[model samples]
Target chain A: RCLFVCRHGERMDVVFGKYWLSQCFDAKGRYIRTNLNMPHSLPQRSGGFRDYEKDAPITVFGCMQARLVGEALLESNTVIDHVYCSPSLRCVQTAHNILKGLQQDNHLKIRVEPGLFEWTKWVAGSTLPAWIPPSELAAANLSVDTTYRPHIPVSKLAISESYDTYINRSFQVTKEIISECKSKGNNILIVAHASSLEACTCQLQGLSPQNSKDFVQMVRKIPYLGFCSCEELGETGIWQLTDPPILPLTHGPTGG
Target chain B: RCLFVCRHGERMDVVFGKYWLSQCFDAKGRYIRTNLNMPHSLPQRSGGFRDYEKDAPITVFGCMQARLVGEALLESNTVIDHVYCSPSLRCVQTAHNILKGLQQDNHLKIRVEPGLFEWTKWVAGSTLPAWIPPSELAAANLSVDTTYRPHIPVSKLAISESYDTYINRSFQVTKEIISECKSKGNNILIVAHASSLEACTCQLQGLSPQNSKDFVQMVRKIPYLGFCSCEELGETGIWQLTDPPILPLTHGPTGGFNWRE
Candidate 1:
């Protein structure tokens, strides 16, 4: 069985050039108008969208990018049996749209795993909004499986999760998904953020999961919806990267 | 490989008494207050919601039912590789929720097959609304694989599809999914409407697909979120029913549709 890991499609935060907290406010310390301006407000430039904050939902083009990835998988005759996605809005939408493209939305449910969320930053008091409740997600019409509860309550994320902790959680979650697939004799797909994707790849390749700096170097090369395919080798229970991470130009004229 | 077919989760149309076109309009020929009252309106009481019309999206309780089915499959160690679902809103939501419970959403995509839509009704001039464009479905956040283009254009559905035509289409689509799964050596899950589900089941069980009345009789007994599990028997390519269709008490306090015809 093979494991295919992919980054979520582009988010509004990146598209509008407001990805960071500093970008959300001006030099005068005034809040800027962006997609998430209403619910999220900052008193000063220093306190804007938190590091653990949720990014804007994927754009229309982003949905197309994910759809293309799904089509490519079908063309390649890949038999995917399970999907694990981050609980973030962007990742959830990306996974949903991708499955839509693959025509499997009805049969498969995207498992929202908080462990697959973006790496926790070192900044203190940086917290994700507790407002993204399950009710809000359902209202948005995002196909979230409300039954598969997350192991960690996203509403109560610690102020600052160390890099080591993020890496360890990444490894543990990756192993759980892999083990489940192995036992079921099936292939799995993972939809996550850049850092989580890198962490997962590192753990699957049998590399040192603690090497955050090295993983960052690898993650920089991956583009939105880019993927790495890893296969389980015989008996040893070790995973090997059969196909290195690469963002194929599958979207044609859209170039996503 | 096994084939598991299920009905979509609960729909608001059934929950509230707005499933029929007459229900959407008052006796005085005025549009009544209902979940679909806003986007849908009747010019006259005689011209109500179309027979082929889609219903309101599934409710929270409906989602729970789908989740329970998914969890049950996981507990039974069923490894499904592919999914086939109706393009209808309720069925699509059901499929997505079930997959979430099964933790298979990332890997398996739901094929939206129009053939899996509800049966051809006896009503005349009944037409599905054109307002439900692909953009609208996308906006609704329904997990529709936008890339897997449908073989049939749902937009230009004939004013009235004959019962025979619907039966044939249902059988063909069901066969297509089964054939694909057989070739890939994988189990498949189908999320569809009651009528389409019965049609598919009849074809799989070596019964005449043209027998709509018999199928309807069998389907009436099956409730929402009900499923039938079938397995392939040897070289003859025959499918045998391992489990008969039954609506388990998975919904807890919330019961299924009260208006069963």
Candidate 2:
């Protein structure tokens, strides 16, 4: 099976303020946005505002960015048999919107992988960002593989969370997913953070993890919906990075 | 000669995610909102996005709430001689929009007060929320008394803080402002947080600060743009809370009146 990994789109906190929940609504509990970057509306979650404090959803523009990727995937005729996403609200939401644009959400469900999430230490505090549970996401009308047990649990991802360990976790999870699904499907998609795009394939290519500074530099270049391909060469249990089916959304106002 | 202490309007962070900076805009530099609560537009500040991370401004509905208070003050014909606001961008923006409604932003410039900010402990970290400098506010076209020197500095506000100490700082600043401006102005306005409504007047009323739980309850009850009157009454230094000149915006739907509160 071939592997396609894409990063989640822009988050609400990066566009607005870190503490935007306090500034986004009014006294009557109305959502009044004044900026173009801010979302014109928000998805109602089961936990309401508190959930967003830790697990924030993507913005409208963020959703749009992911939809563009889906459109490209649809145009390329890349038949994705299975889709796996991180256990983060942003990644799950991105995966949902992408499937909508791809027109396969009705039958194809997204499998949430807790192992796909980035290092928990990046989130500080005694606890990690409380991801919206699979049951809750399914309740919210998302096409989730609710019964699909994740390879890694909260204990393994609790919070060195060093670069090497992080890459190691991602590598092992890819191996597990490939071993489980290689017989059923040939195309698998991973929707996750900026780092996941690199983490998923780096170790498979027999490459060691880079230092923090170099790793960050590599991630910084990955766009909102940038995707990379890892081809399973002749079933030799080895993978090689290759060109993806979908082109990178790199055009600007000048129409590059 | 009276004092009007009003709480600032709603801030954006309370409604949106605390880390919404990454998700708010697109790659083309266009602002696209997906929610009714998010601001339809943002004020282009001097330092750009970095400035907003530390000093978040109020939302459009928040501005409207403050404008309503200004309209009520205008209708009441209460002449405000001086306006002082907390160093927070939310409070400062609240003061600016309130002036726009009162039609006195031209002459009645706002004096930024560093001591008026709430306790820094609520913010946990090595540093406090970096406030946009008054010089930058002035550059942004908000009427600011750039020359006015504040009674306290960042050193005093570095981080308890206990309720007593917070109240003590607020009391000292209000007294200093009053002493500095009593000769030039009779009616003065203070624009700050929900706690400011109580902080400014409690010490003046010769009362002790309440425990943390009780203090939180008090803040919870103070609504957006809510104001109270503190009368000078003989200028003997003591202040008393009395009925305000402008009536409270207490009308509810059923025609108290159907518009959103």
Candidate 3:
């Protein structure tokens, strides 16, 4: 199986501090600059609506991040056949940003998958406020970060399951995507968050608990807004394996 | 031929005696009884909005007039198969009164005929005021009553016409009604005002040039509400007519009227 993954771009605001994290691409995995004026007034914590300043175009750093991701893909010598992104506004923006930089906007058709939304908990309630910080917010309040992983336990807040169930569910989704790639005979580019990325890598590599962190550790090293590739080998019985993992340059976070 | 023709009952504010000579029905005819009080403050005419007094019912005299006309028709043995009247409030109320008194209120299917409206010069651009004397009102107004006569000079106000021009037009309308009656086998009852009734008679019979006052004098002795009869005597050839000649009757004007002596 050949697979590529991506996350969404920067959003106007991050509600509940954690529910939805910024996916804006800068030199680092950090969020890009943005104007704070917002149309909606989201809640402070429980439920919030993210506000983006009126008519602010995507930032310059965002464009650079998108181009960097695209360049990395191009250098890897993989022709992207199809791309799937979460329905998150940042994700859609990120995908479009990348397309614009690559000048592939006209050629590539972007599709949003509802199942790819960050985490269901972020949307559990009606309100969404962006002023709150991520770590301070509850795990349930954490939205899908375009690139960041969920470090908290799922059950800490009101979520029903422990972290294990959440990770496993995420892994299963990754497996399904891989299988789908095999059927299409096309390389896959999935835009997802850090937690989902880790879960998905664990499923793809068959990494155990002890080695799972290490196997997925290389993914963290890859820069935010950076993409990693893996190939699925076909044996007598469709047994699959990936290529030697390659790591990209990492950058420190620059606040959005 | 049994024809019963009667003028409607007393309108509200019976003091509007100028009604007889005017081209149009007076203000009382134009306005419904509900507007009797503070008519000057009526908001608007068309919409459902009404004044404070609009809730009031018909007047006693108006009701009596309706009953009297209905009784006259009933006593004459006139089987009113179809009833047509002017759209005026008084005419509509009169028709209702007639129907109610006849006990045929349940089948009260009176249809308004615009053509059956009173001969008013106002609609024909001739309205005389309440205080106007009858002579002046007659001079100022277009003559709906005289217009029906066989041959009136086609003045700007009155259409100049040959005898046949006037007679044939009304005859045609009467013939249409007669044909309608023939088809349905229903007796037709027209409840209208003085001039319209004269027009119908002028069209059915021949016209008399003496004008409405003379015309009224000619028929006054017959009955207040007169009856004229006619029948088809020939073999579908000649329209035969029979009626007693006009003769003066005492208890003048109140004893009622007949088209013949």
Which has the higher lDDT value, candidate number 1 or candidate number 2?
A: 2
Give the candidate number with the greatest lDDT: 2
lDDT of 2 by residue, A113-213 (tens): 99999866577456777777888788877889888889997567857377778888899998998888877988999999888987888878777778878
For residues B1-261, write the lDDT of model 3, one tens digit per residue.
233344454443332232321322244534332211112122122322222122112234345445545654564465776665544444555566777766665564665444444333323223211221212212422111212221111121122333333334435545555555564544555565554455555545544544545655553333222333344443351333344122111110101111111
For model 1 the local lDDT of residue B229 reads: 79
Q: Candidate 1: misplaced stretches above 4 Å? A: A19-54, A122-125, A131-139, A155-157, A244-247, A250-256, B1-261
Computed on alpha carbons, the lDDT of every model, listed in order, comes to: 0.63, 0.76, 0.42
Off by over 4 Å in 3: A9-60, A119-162, A209-223, A235-256, B1-261
Assess candidate 1 and give its lDDT. Answer: 0.63
Off by over 4 Å in 2: A27-41, A44-47, A251-256, B1-261
TM-score of chain B of each: 0.74, 0.88, 0.53
lDDT of 1 by residue, B142-217 (tens): 5556666554567535557777777777777777777656767568888987776667767777877646576667
lDDT of 1 by residue, A149-232 (tens): 665667545546777788777877888777656666477888998787668777678776647677666667666776678888
Q: Per-model TM-score of chain A alone?
A: 0.77, 0.90, 0.57
Report per-prediction Cα RMSD to one decimal.
Answer: 23.6, 16.0, 36.9
